[PDB]
Write an enzyme that holds these catalytic residues in place. Structure first.
Site, short mmCIF file in Angstrom:
data_model
loop_
_atom_site.label_atom_id
_atom_site.label_comp_id
_atom_site.label_asym_id
_atom_site.label_seq_id
_atom_site.Cartn_x
_atom_site.Cartn_y
_atom_site.Cartn_z
N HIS A 128 0.80 -1.22 0.00
CA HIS A 128 0.00 0.00 0.00
C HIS A 128 0.84 1.27 0.00
O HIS A 128 0.89 1.99 0.99
CB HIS A 128 -0.96 0.00 1.19
CG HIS A 128 -2.04 -1.04 1.09
ND1 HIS A 128 -2.01 -2.21 1.82
CD2 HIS A 128 -3.16 -1.09 0.33
CE1 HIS A 128 -3.07 -2.94 1.51
NE2 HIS A 128 -3.78 -2.28 0.61
N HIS A 134 0.89 1.38 -5.78
CA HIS A 134 -0.41 0.72 -5.80
C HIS A 134 -1.51 1.71 -6.15
O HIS A 134 -2.44 1.39 -6.88
CB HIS A 134 -0.72 0.08 -4.44
CG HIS A 134 -2.15 -0.35 -4.31
ND1 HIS A 134 -2.74 -1.25 -5.17
CD2 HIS A 134 -3.12 0.03 -3.44
CE1 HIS A 134 -4.01 -1.40 -4.85
NE2 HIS A 134 -4.26 -0.63 -3.80
MG LIG Z 1 -7.33 0.46 1.20
ZN LIG Z 2 -5.88 0.09 -2.45
#
Ligand SMILES: [Mg+2]
Ligand SMILES: [Zn+2]
Ligand SMILES: C=CCCOc1ncc(C(=C)O)cc1-c1nc2c(CC)[n+](C3CN(CC)C3)[nH]c2c(=O)[nH]1
EC number: 3.1.4.35
Length: 323
Positions: A77, A81
């Protein structure tokens, strides 16, 4: 600064040159500057820049602020991403032919939401934040904790001086856009996808799905956000393999945190010691969460088939390793 001067002075390559219209797009060989250029091109080719009088310098500054607000050391994350989620949104709108089914404001909101949906992600789940008594969980009553935080960060950047890419909207358009952005970001909480997808799938199954209906349109936008958020699961095998390693790195890191902070044995998904379960978990994840969504999306727009096709191919790859 510095990076800003370079970005703002650069000539933005065409979408064709950048390959951002391809569902099979890979960001691995791109520098941060190149991803920023790709992002400017997304706004430009979605007819958002002149449409809403966005100043070049401001858009560049905003993009860089968004990129900076992601935690680079969080394995999955992070900015890449978010960037990939936005690229999938662009491809779905273009190659997937979803653009003409939406309004200019919905498109504007979706791109901003895609880029901002994981802002300042800590690398741990909502459940972990709740179990470790995060102040974030308390303020948001344990409901879509991370997503409310991502939205908070989204607003913060949109309001930061020199970064106001929505300053050109009329009062009513601004109001409408922020509401769509919040809903789009909250939609990325997989808990809400599981909770609302039943209705979406049923409407389609009974041939009742109607985009002209305000409520169903909103439901669709939520599903579209999930489809883009999970897009790595549709990528060519080499790409999916690489990203799956990032996901495992992040989940296993949380597992380590759980053993230490909660004194509990993590579930398989977050248990490094049982990483041998990855292939079987992946197949189950594809079956229970992914396939139905990409099947539904293709039903709405046949041109989105590549996403479903790519997902099916990865299921075959993971199953071959699992059996
Ligand atoms: Mg999320
Ligand atoms: Zn995401
Ligand atoms: C240990 C990690 C292995 C690799 O894992 C992955 N790699 C890549 C992607 C992707 C989007 O490409 C996705 C995953 C991946 N993600 C998963 C999630 C979070 C959405 N969950 C929770 C549990 N379930 C309850 C209903 C939802 N299970 C997953 C899984 O099995 N795989």
């Amino acid at each position: 600064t510095r990076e800003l001067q370079s970005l703002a002075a650069a000539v933005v390559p065409s979408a064709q040159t950048l390959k951002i219209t391809d569902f099979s797009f890979s960001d691995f060989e791109l520098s941060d500057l190149e991803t920023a250029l790709c992002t400017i091109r997304m706004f430009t080719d979605l007819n958002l820049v002149q449409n809403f009088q966005m100043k070049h310098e401001v858009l560049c500054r905003w993009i860089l602020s968004v990129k900076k607000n992601y935690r680079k050391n969080v394995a999955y994350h992070n900015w890449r991403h978010a960037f990939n989620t936005a690229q999938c949104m662009f491809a779905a709108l273009k190659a997937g032919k979803i653009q003409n089914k939406l309004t200019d404001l919905e498109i504007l909101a979706l791109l901003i939401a895609a880029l901002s949906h994981d802002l300042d992600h800590p690398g741990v789940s909502n459940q972990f934040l709740i179990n470790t008594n995060s102040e974030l969980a308390l303020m948001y009553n344990d409901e879509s904790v991370l997503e409310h935080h991502h939205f908070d960060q989204c607003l913060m950047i949109l309001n930061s001086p020199g970064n106001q890419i929505l300053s050109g909207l009329s009062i009513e358009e601004y109001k409408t856009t922020l509401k769509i952005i919040k809903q789009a970001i909250l939609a990325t909480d997989l808990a809400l996808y599981i909770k609302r997808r039943g209705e979406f799938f049923e409407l389609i199954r009974k041939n009742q799905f109607n985009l002209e209906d305000p409520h169903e349109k909103e439901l669709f936008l939520a599903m579209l956000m999930t489809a883009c958020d999970l897009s790595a699961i549709t990528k060519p095998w080499p790409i999916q393999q690489r990203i799956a390693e990032l996901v495992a790195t992040e989940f296993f890191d949380q597992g380590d945190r759980e053993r230490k902070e909660l004194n509990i044995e993590p579930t398989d998904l977050m248990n490094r010691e049982k990483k041998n379960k990855i292939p079987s978990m992946q197949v189950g994840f594809i079956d229970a969460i992914c396939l139905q969504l990409y099947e539904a999306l293709t039903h709405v727009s046949e041109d989105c088939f590549p996403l479903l096709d790519g997902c099916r191919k990865n299921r075959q790859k993971w199953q071959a390793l699992a059996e």
